[PDB]
């Protein structure tokens, strides 16, 4: 039961289901103490069973209990666990993650196969703690708190922090992904080249494995944090290291379109 | 029906009222039992509606006040041809009511809204998914507090063990409680004026080291 931005309150439906259950339980106890006839006690016990069923798995038996003035069934525990919106598929087999971004992609013909164009501001936000550490190592900031307070305002950003960010991302790689992720090559590892502008630059040869074109497609970027994750990405997930299809064994990163035309 | 309680709940509370009526009925008055029963049944039903219909429970008298406010606002909207102002409702309520009181009463009467309220025409998003968590500290805040503790220890190491311990004991960094000057003096065996003097000189050394290194300034927010 939480107070939102404007001081209003928002609460779970489990609270209303529990209130139903407790009201009916206390009323049953009071009816038993006062020696009610068997018809009243029977109705109350049946309502108590209905309330327990509503709490555990609403809509399972009988009409689903709804909030007043609403046809929306209350969300029970079973509804929380199962379904595409259920706990398993939404918060266990897949999560929203930190150190990730998203932007519109652009063809980067000048890129090498192991490279991708990454906007400056996206990289500044993605590697922000590494950039704070590098700004503390160099004389750009007294400590990490001052470096963050400096990065907070965009007009306080000077040009030395861009060189520091260049130093931070050295050797490291990022993960590019495009939905739908139909096979394991929907995510690939690329060395990032910092670029001005707000677009991600993608190598042409991998556009077939991502099924990506440039009619408005967007991609997501992720930063592997550990030395272990970085090694996994650079060795096993690097774009230049996966040149053949795991399905057919044939080449996947192969000439196409303009390249074939010119040759 | 339609007051916040299901039909069967109203039936059961009315049965409670009927039990009360059976226990209080006097047949000598020659009144049929339905007469005396109806009063108790309506009483129990209205009491239950007033007691249980709200997630945030509100006392019965305040519920009566809010319902009277609603009825008055509806009368004013039927006579004015538009929704009334706070001041017009305060006028129609009589003495003791101003616009501020009407506003505060309407604010108190606000019921909460479901976290699972749908967003969009697809079943894919909920309202509570757009609600942040303001209680648990962010990683930035925890890192900042840790760095503050570490810089505090770095600055206290530039004192002697005794004059840093005096400050640690007086400001609560040790044991969590702030000791009085008498207690720190009795712990170091010295006089309370003596411990106050060494506390002041330790604070002086800390202020000097701060003006020199400018380390703890950024943590002032």
């Amino acid at each position: 039961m939480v107070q939102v931005d404007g001081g209003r309150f928002a609460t779970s439906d489990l609270n209303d289901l529990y209130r139903r259950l407790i009201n009916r339980n206390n009323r049953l106890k009071k009816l038993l103490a006062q020696g009610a006839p068997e018809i009243i006690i029977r109705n109350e016990k049946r309502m108590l069973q209905e309330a327990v069923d509503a709490l555990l798995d609403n809509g399972r038996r009988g009409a689903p209990v709804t909030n007043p003035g609403s046809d929306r069934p209350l969300r029970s525990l079973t509804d929380i666990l199962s379904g595409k919106q259920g706990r398993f598929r939404q918060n266990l087999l897949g999560k929203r993650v930190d150190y990730s971004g998203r932007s519109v992609i652009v063809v980067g013909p000048q890129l090498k196969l192991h490279q991708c164009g990454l906007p400056k501001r996206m990289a500044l936000e993605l590697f922000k703690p590494f950039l704070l550490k590098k700004m503390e190592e160099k004389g750009i900031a007294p400590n990490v708190k001052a470096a963050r307070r400096m990065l907070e305002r965009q007009r306080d950003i000077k040009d030395e922090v861009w060189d520091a960010l260049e130093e931070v991302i050295h050797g490291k790689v990022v993960l590019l992904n495009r939905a739908p992720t139909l096979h394991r090559l929907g995510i690939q590892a690329f060395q990032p080249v910092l670029v001005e502008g707000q677009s991600i630059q993608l190598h042409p040869l991998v556009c077939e494995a991502f099924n990506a074109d440039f009619d408005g497609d967007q991609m997501a970027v992720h930063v592997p944090l550990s030395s272990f994750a970085q090694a996994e990405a650079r060795i096993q997930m690097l774009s230049a290291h996966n040149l053949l299809s795991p399905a057919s064994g044939e080449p996947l990163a192969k000439p196409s379109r303009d390249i074939i035309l010119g040759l | 029906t339609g007051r916040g309680l299901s039909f069967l709940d109203l039936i059961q509370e009315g049965n409670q009222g009927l039990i009360r009526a059976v226990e209080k009925f006097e047949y000598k008055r020659r009144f049929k039992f339905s007469t005396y029963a109806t009063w108790w049944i309506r009483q129990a039903i209205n009491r239950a509606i007033a007691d249980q219909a709200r997630t945030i429970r509100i006392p019965v008298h305040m519920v009566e006040t809010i319902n009277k406010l609603s009825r008055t606002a509806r009368q004013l909207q039927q006579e004015l041809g538009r929704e009334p102002t706070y001041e017009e409702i305060a006028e129609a309520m009589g003495p003791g009511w101003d616009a501020k009181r009407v506003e505060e009463t309407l604010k108190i009467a606000q019921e909460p809204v479901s976290l699972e309220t749908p967003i969009g025409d697809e079943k894919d998003s909920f309202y509570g998914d757009f609600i942040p968590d303001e209680h648990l500290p962010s990683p930035v805040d925890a890192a900042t507090q840790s760095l503050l503790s570490e810089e505090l220890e770095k600055a206290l190491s530039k004192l002697s063990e005794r004059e840093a311990m005096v400050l640690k004991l007086r400001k609560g960094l040790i044991d969590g409680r702030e000791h009085t000057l008498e207690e720190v003096g009795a712990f170091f065996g010295v006089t309370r004026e003596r411990i106050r003097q060494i506390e002041n000189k330790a604070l002086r050394k800390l202020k000097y080291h701060e003006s020199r290194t400018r380390k703890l300034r950024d943590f002032l927010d």
């Binding site: 018809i39 029977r42 109705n43 049946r46 309502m47 209905e50 009988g62 | 069967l8």
Partner: peptide, 14 residues
Amino acid sequence: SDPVRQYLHEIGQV
């Protein structure tokens, strides 16, 4: 299956 119909049937037996 309808609790209210069942309760009304039970009420109608007295």
